[PDB]
Design a protein around this ligand. Structure first.
Ligand code: NAG
Length: 246
């Protein structure tokens, strides 16, 4: 398991949590020195548990699929909650089985569905450590509309930060003040699968992408990533979605 406590949290302790999260995901090989997530894991070993504690010390446990860093569900006191999707239902066969009751959320875990449920795009939802504190607190008691926004915050401040150093740094900058994600942050989130694929395809193609990936940079400028010498590949991305899952 991995843990993070909002009480006394700072950029360093958050950085340690994101390091722990990354290090808890298994891999047998690296591609261009980036860990390649496994094609599959059978049984309960597929799921990592993240223990998150809000400022008051109340906690939820979040179940994460270690092959794709997708959040499947979470436990709050004696109630488990899972996304309304086959991968999440499968996860519910292995984690939080001791919950007194299980609620299936009225949406799947993908960004478009969560944004519909929340009533707003994540362009408009502030993120940061204070927002994460709020998100944990919200998830402690069932409210499906509120939970959608909370889960958008949760996914970005955990999984997406694990996947991209830039996003981790963006949250560290929001340690004591929330701010909506940069357009670059959104671009990277939307491009993780694509980047992961092209970095793997580059292995037998002299480091060259078969298809360029279009991103937005830190200054709001759109750019094409064409090969593995790009800063996105050398410095930023920290985990690759296995092409067998793309
Ligand atoms: C590879 O990417 C670099 C740096 O982003 C770029 O300047 C260059 O034109 C690209 N080279 C090839 C062969 O695609």
């Amino acid at each position: 398991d991995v843990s993070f406590r909002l009480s006394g949290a700072d950029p360093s302790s958050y950085g340690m949590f994101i390091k722990d999260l990354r290090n808890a995901l298994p891999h047998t090989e690296k591609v261009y020195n980036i860990p390649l997530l496994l094609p599959s894991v059978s049984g309960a070993g597929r799921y990592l548990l993240m223990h998150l504690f809000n400022y008051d010390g109340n906690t939820i446990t979040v179940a994460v699929d270690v092959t794709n860093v997708y959040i499947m569900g979470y436990l709050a006191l004696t109630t488990s909650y899972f996304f309304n999707e086959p991968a999440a239902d499968l996860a519910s066969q292995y984690v939080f089985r001791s919950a007194r009751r299980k609620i299936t959320l009225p949406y799947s875990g993908n960004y478009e569905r969560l944004q519909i449920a929340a009533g707003k795009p994540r362009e408009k939802i502030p993120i940061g450590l204070p927002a994460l504190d709020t998100a944990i607190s919200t998830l402690l008691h069932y409210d499906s509309t509120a939970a959608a926004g909370a889960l958008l915050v949760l996914i970005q401040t955990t999984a997406e930060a694990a996947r991209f150093k830039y996003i981790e740094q963006q949250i560290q900058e929001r340690a004591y003040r929330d701010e909506v994600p940069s357009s670059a942050t959104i671009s990277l989130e939307n491009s993780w699968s694509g980047l992961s694929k092209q970095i793997q395809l580059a292995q037998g193609n002299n480091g060259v992408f078969r298809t360029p990936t279009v991103l937005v940079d830190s200054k709001g400028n759109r750019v094409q990533i064409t090969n593995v010498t790009s800063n996105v590949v050398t410095s930023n991305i920290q985990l690759l979605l296995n092409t067998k899952n793309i």
